[PDB]
Design an enzyme around this catalytic site. Structure first.
Site, PDB file in Angstrom:
ATOM      1  N   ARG C  29       0.805  -1.222   0.000  1.00  0.00           N
ATOM      2  CA  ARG C  29       0.000   0.000   0.000  1.00  0.00           C
ATOM      3  C   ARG C  29       0.838   1.272   0.000  1.00  0.00           C
ATOM      4  O   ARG C  29       0.647   2.151  -0.840  1.00  0.00           O
ATOM      5  CB  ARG C  29      -0.948   0.029   1.201  1.00  0.00           C
ATOM      6  CG  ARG C  29      -1.811   1.279   1.267  1.00  0.00           C
ATOM      7  CD  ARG C  29      -2.662   1.294   2.525  1.00  0.00           C
ATOM      8  NE  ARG C  29      -3.781   0.359   2.449  1.00  0.00           N
ATOM      9  CZ  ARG C  29      -4.552   0.038   3.483  1.00  0.00           C
ATOM     10  NH1 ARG C  29      -4.315   0.570   4.675  1.00  0.00           N
ATOM     11  NH2 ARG C  29      -5.554  -0.819   3.329  1.00  0.00           N
ATOM     12  N   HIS C  75      -8.083  -3.785  -7.857  1.00  0.00           N
ATOM     13  CA  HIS C  75      -7.889  -3.025  -6.622  1.00  0.00           C
ATOM     14  C   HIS C  75      -9.131  -3.019  -5.728  1.00  0.00           C
ATOM     15  O   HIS C  75     -10.086  -2.288  -5.989  1.00  0.00           O
ATOM     16  CB  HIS C  75      -7.462  -1.590  -6.946  1.00  0.00           C
ATOM     17  CG  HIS C  75      -6.806  -0.881  -5.801  1.00  0.00           C
ATOM     18  ND1 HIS C  75      -5.649  -1.336  -5.212  1.00  0.00           N
ATOM     19  CD2 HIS C  75      -7.145   0.255  -5.146  1.00  0.00           C
ATOM     20  CE1 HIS C  75      -5.302  -0.512  -4.236  1.00  0.00           C
ATOM     21  NE2 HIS C  75      -6.191   0.459  -4.176  1.00  0.00           N
ATOM     22  N   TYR C 119     -17.379  13.345 -15.700  1.00  0.00           N
ATOM     23  CA  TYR C 119     -17.049  14.449 -16.594  1.00  0.00           C
ATOM     24  C   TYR C 119     -15.685  14.220 -17.236  1.00  0.00           C
ATOM     25  O   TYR C 119     -15.473  14.547 -18.406  1.00  0.00           O
ATOM     26  CB  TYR C 119     -17.036  15.775 -15.834  1.00  0.00           C
ATOM     27  CG  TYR C 119     -18.333  16.105 -15.133  1.00  0.00           C
ATOM     28  CD1 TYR C 119     -19.400  16.659 -15.830  1.00  0.00           C
ATOM     29  CD2 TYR C 119     -18.489  15.867 -13.775  1.00  0.00           C
ATOM     30  CE1 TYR C 119     -20.588  16.961 -15.192  1.00  0.00           C
ATOM     31  CE2 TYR C 119     -19.675  16.168 -13.128  1.00  0.00           C
ATOM     32  CZ  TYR C 119     -20.719  16.714 -13.840  1.00  0.00           C
ATOM     33  OH  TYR C 119     -21.898  17.013 -13.198  1.00  0.00           O
TER      34      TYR C 119
END
Ligand SMILES: COc1c(N2C[C@@H]3CCCN[C@@H]3C2)c(F)cc2c(=O)c(C(=O)O)cn(C3CC3)c12
Ligand SMILES: COc1c(N2C[C@@H]3CCCN[C@@H]3C2)c(F)cc2c(=O)c(C(=O)O)cn(C3CC3)c12
Ligand SMILES: [Mg+2]
Ligand SMILES: [Mg+2]
Lengths: 198, 482, 485, 194
Positions: C29, C75, C119
DNA sequence: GTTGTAT
DNA sequence: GATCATACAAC
DNA sequence: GATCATACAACGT
DNA sequence: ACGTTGTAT
């Protein structure tokens, strides 16, 4: 030329990427749908004369709302604060901060809705502004656009196309707002059933 | 200061913008299609799940996968909306016949929301496959997506009357819709009845379709409103809870509610009942404990002095709702307040178009395959001469032309002959091709007969509908009273 | 109550759970693998984008789709974390060499967040293709995904030293890494240098790798920290804003900040300065304008007359983040364990990984070429004895006996015979044979070459050098951060 | 049982007013909250969500500890009181079960919660009220959760027992302490990587 | 107030 | 992740 | 959609 | 004791 000097307290809204000028005859205020377009506008706007105010979501339809709800809502409050004009019995047009208020809603249908609501707000509670000819509407060729595109297409006065909002007759106007936005549903349904080409 | 400026009348821009938003919300958001009973988000979710390969046979895929694909390809909106729709399509108390089968927390009856998309996976329900039956057989028109780089169905085949069966809702601009859910079997009976006798009336229809069948169950009071509804498209019916007053070990009374009305929260009712209890409206009650398990459903106890009066109060206070029929749906582009007969006719016609289109697809496929097989059969009948021609050729073009000239073949047949694996030049291979060819002939005959006779198409519809009814229908949940 | 009740000692479960979470954060991580300089999330975004087919050439795809796929397949965490990671690796002021091309509001240096995923769209940058180059030639190991129904690369090929070049950060458990970005061409020159002269000292390396090259640029004070860092893995250096003093048209001094240090917000500096000014903790300031346009950074602090702009400047360097410190803690995961590495150790790791990749690739290509050549020989024999072949086939009922008799007759393998049985009729033309011959010969040449490459380490090294040279030729930058004493 | 009608935002309470059978399940997030609450037997089992990673009290100031809303919610639910009010004979639940997610972050939250409980709810853990659920968590049906980890006649639970309090204090001061170096050494010593 | 697709 | 306002129509 | 508190190391103020 | 950095709940 007179410009801001930083340092000021101002007490303007937490949003609002204000410009670096103080001339309410050269500065502009873009009302923008969300911070998605807010970022694009803010970062590529010529920060000397162009300010950006993000209105979040669908603004309240004042025709279908109590005045107690109007004076409570913080979005309209933020807009009025940004204009520094005053509310109703204090509305001084000769004391505004921008003489060019651009409505820069998104290019979808919900954008047209927000534009509508905003126009109702402006005609019903900022009427001198529209009367003086300060209310403009952007005509793009927004969050799905870059800085350079936004500017070079819609914000650069040398290559942009804008519309000045000018009222014809106040009677037909008031009636139109009373129909499309008023609590009266049936006449609106009649309007949509008589004036829509599917 | 601008270089190029234009004037814009207020009323003009107001009118244009408003008409735009209104029309777009009516015919592309808030209202369903009369044919498949779906609004854009739901249709896009079902199709998106289809292309994703999360059919009931295949294992589940995480919700973020589906939401992502659906937004990126078809539905140009937010995650929360799509996921909310999907969640609503996977709850027994929302959809009378669930279109989505999901794993993990998908919310409870008690208002609790679903878990995040990163914790829940989902696939299509078995019955949604009926919504997607033979979508890959040109049964449905397609259109470019918003980005114009994908394609999506305008409607779905919908092999079960999803509109009446699952109901619809609700709010749009200038109008709104409200249609209750129905029992699968009964709706199918109604469709078949409309198909058999076109001179049928509303009462006759109500004989096999008594009324709404809510996923929660409960009771409906009156029938006049139901008749007015099915006849006019608009009506009003009263809904009440299914209860029972038991007896305690202490020797008292105990008013227990087992079924709450449609779209009614037991928790909210609990809160409102307590709120009304600390106001001296409902006396007699000793304790109101919600005793619902994962195996079923809410105990309200009373004291001496009166259970019937107290329960009557508990119904006349909130437990009792008003369903307002406003059956509005999109039909041929324009929205309309439809009766029962109009919805039924629309669905029937849609089914006819679907079945016919499918039959045509199968027809064309079969005929093409038959043509190619004729070519191949000729080739195997003249293998040595064929290979002679192919070897004599320098480029595949003149080979094709030579085969087409010698054996009187089409471009497709010669192409197929050229694209023949060597291993199919064996002995037993020719006969297999012959058998496939004959079967194909019979098939084509049958399909042409189907296309020449509307009655057969109608019968196919009735048969397949009956098979859906057999495979999926539930017993009636809602008891109707008078 | 219950029935089956076990007993847990506090210290035991504490130590266990803590070791669990700690190791999970450290190795999967917070810290990047030294070879490709990537964390699991970035590696999964890149690989996910590769499998999505959003390569440089192919058009963009909606961000929510990319994140949806990365989440669903590789993930197993928040959508927000993934999208944030991607957006970050799309920003020029965050990544020295961006690994993602984006469209729409992807954030600003002022700290403004990116637009919503509905977007923005994205894809791989032309340089990330080098991070993924030759992924499909067994140059890299794979493992099962968390759902155990997909597969993911443990490390990436990484055809440019991404660790040093892009830097790394940072916070783990019991540890924290901090590596600054570097110039591409320089890092490659250092890599080649170490490849050629292996007895090179740290100074020799600094002769081509002078020091950090931050994406914003700015200035560096204290090269001693740079040397100490490159020799030990730990060290402190000073970063100062690139500034200049102008004169207004009115005659008084003007401070112009043009470059801010690494990970420093312009707006935050503006606010901090204002708060310092309206508090009289700093004096002499007339104005503070932000004149940065979408083509350059210009932060103006205007000074009043009878006040020194130098005193104000140094006071800003002392009291604000106009001048900050950087703490080299070059820490990375190597051989499954966290290690504090010197420059030479990192370079060595990269060169080793690179040799592995190249050798693997060559082996793959060799195997494939030889297989295709074998099948081609089969096809040649068949296309020679076509009559006999077709006869054996026609006189066969089962395909098994046809294959068996083809193998028995023409002395062929099972694969070859299956290939012959799978031949299209159009491959029996007169002009088909010669083509197959040419392809076969070319295959012989190629196999000879690859065999030679596998026989000689020198050729592997040389290939690495040349391809590095091509990467640098195609992507390298001009230096931005000026190093000064 | 109770009687309702009486006056946290979260916390789906039980029904029985008996701190000898009743159980409080500390579950993380409303995602686990949904399932856990949906299948919980609403008589002697109540659920309390713990939104986000709880505050490490071994490294935080009292000012920030008293400020934290989650800790205040746990203390409000437990009905014990805080500091000089920790009346263990006023506890509302006989079993405080730590039901975190089955990932490593869940183990982390388990550690944090155990520090909170050991340091500021010491009598509770010293009287065998604290348990650890043993799952095989939002990715689970309510019936699945009920049948697996929430059913008394089934399920496996760990009773948190404290031995040498010196060893406890030591380990807490080492793992969750202010000092980083001993944590790095502990990591270097008690971990098998490859 | 609440219902459900939306900003 | 949770929690916030609101358009729109109809009880 | 925008914001909100926290672990975790390391440095700063 | 706070803030601030980047992957996580
Ligand atoms: C409720 O937890 C979060 C908070 N808060 C924690 C505090 C206590 C509870 C209520 N008030 C605040 C809100 C927050 F501010 C941000 C995020 C967040 O960004 C995030 C993510 O996935 O990106 C996920 N979560 C949840 C998965 C843990 C966040
Ligand atoms: C800021 O808009 C939203 C609000 N607010 C509106 C209020 C007015 C101004 C001050 N902020 C509040 C919060 C909200 F409460 C919820 C949502 C929401 O749920 C949502 C979604 O996609 O699911 C999308 N938006 C997108 C329109 C941005 C929401
Ligand atoms: Mg929302
Ligand atoms: Mg977050």
């Amino acid at each position: 030329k007179h410009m801001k000097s930083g340092l000021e307290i101002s007490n303007l809204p937490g949003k609002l990427a204000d410009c670096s000028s103080n001339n309410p005859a050269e500065t502009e205020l873009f009302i923008v749908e969300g911070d998605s377009a807010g970022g694009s506008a803010k970062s590529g706007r010529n920060r000397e004369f162009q300010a950006i105010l993000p209105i979040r979501g669908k603004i309240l339809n004042v025709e279908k709302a109590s005045m107690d709800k109007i004076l409570a809502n913080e979005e309209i409050r933020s807009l009025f604060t940004a204009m520094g004009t005053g509310f109703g019995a204090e509305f001084d047009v000769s004391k505004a901060r921008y003489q060019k208020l651009v409505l820069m809603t998104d290019a979808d249908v919900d954008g047209a809705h927000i534009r509508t609501l905003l126009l109702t707000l402006i005609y019903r509670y900022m009427k001198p502004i529209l009367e003086a000819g300060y209310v403009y509407i952007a005509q793009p060729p927004l969050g799905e656009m870059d800085d350079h595109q936004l500017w070079e297409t819609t914000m650069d006065p040398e290559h942009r196309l804008m519309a000045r909002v000018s009222v014809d007759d106040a009677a037909e106007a008031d009636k139109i707002f009373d129909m499309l936005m008023g609590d009266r549903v049936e006449p609106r349904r009649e309007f949509i059933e008589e004036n829509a080409v599917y | 200061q601008d270089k190029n400026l234009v004037n814009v009348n207020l009323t003009k821009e107001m009118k244009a913008s408003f008409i735009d938003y209104a029309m777009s919300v009516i015919v592309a958001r808030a209202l369903p299609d009369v044919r498949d009973g779906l609004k854009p988000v739901h249709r896009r979710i079902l199709y998106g799940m289809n292309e994703l390969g999360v059919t009931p046979d295949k294992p589940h895929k995480k919700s973020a996968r589906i939401t992502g694909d659906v937004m990126g390809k078809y539905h140009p909106h937010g995650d929360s909306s799509i996921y909310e729709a999907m969640v609503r399509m996977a709850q027994w108390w929302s959809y009378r016949y669930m279109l989505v089968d999901g794993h993990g927390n998908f919310g409870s009856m008690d208002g609790d929301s679903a878990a995040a998309q990163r914790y829940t996976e989902a696939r299509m329900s078995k019955i949604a496959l009926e919504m997607l039956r033979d979508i890959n057989k040109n049964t449905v028109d397609f259109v470019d997506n918003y980005d114009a780089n994908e394609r999506e169905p305008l409607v779905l085949p919908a092999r079960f009357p999803n509109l009446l069966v699952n109901g619809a809702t609700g709010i749009a601009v200038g109008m709104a819709t409200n249609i209750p859910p129905h029992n699968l079997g009964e709706t199918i009976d109604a469709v078949k009845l409309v198909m058999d006798n076109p001179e049928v009336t509303t009462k006759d229809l109500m004989e096999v379709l008594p009324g709404p069948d809510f996923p929660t169950g409960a009771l409906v009071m009156g029938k006049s409103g139901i008749h007015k509804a099915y006849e006019t498209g608009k009506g009003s019916i009263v809904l009440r809870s299914r209860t029972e007053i038991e007896t305690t070990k202490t020797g008292r009374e105990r008013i227990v509610v087992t079924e709450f009305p449609y779209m009614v929260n037991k928790t909210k009712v609990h809160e409102h009942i307590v709120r009304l209890v600390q106001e001296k409206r409902i006396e007699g009650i000793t304790a109101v404990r919600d005793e619902s398990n994962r195996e079923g459903v809410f105990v309200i106890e009373v004291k001496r002095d009166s259970a019937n009066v107290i329960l009557n109060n508990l119904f006349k206070m909130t437990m009792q709702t008003n369903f307002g029929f406003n059956m509005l749906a999109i039909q041929n582009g324009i929205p309309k307040i439809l009766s029962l007969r109009q919805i039924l006719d629309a669905y029937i016609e849609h089914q006819k178009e679907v079945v016919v289109r499918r039959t045509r697809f199968d027809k064309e496929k079969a005929e093409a395959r038959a043509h190619i097989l004729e070519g191949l059969l000729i080739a195997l009948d003249h293998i040595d001469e064929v290979i002679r021609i192919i070897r004599a050729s320098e480029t595949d073009a003149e080979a094709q032309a030579e085969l087409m000239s010698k054996f009187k073949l089409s471009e497709r047949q010669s192409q197929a002959i050229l694209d023949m694996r060597l291993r199919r030049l064996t002995g037993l291979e020719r006969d297999k091709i012959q058998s496939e060819y004959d079967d194909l002939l019979a098939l084509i005959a049958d399909l042409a007969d189907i296309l020449a006779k509307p009655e057969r198409v109608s019968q196919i519809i009735k048969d397949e509908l009956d098979e859906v009814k057999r495979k999926f229908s539930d017993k009636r949940r809602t008891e109707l009273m008078v």
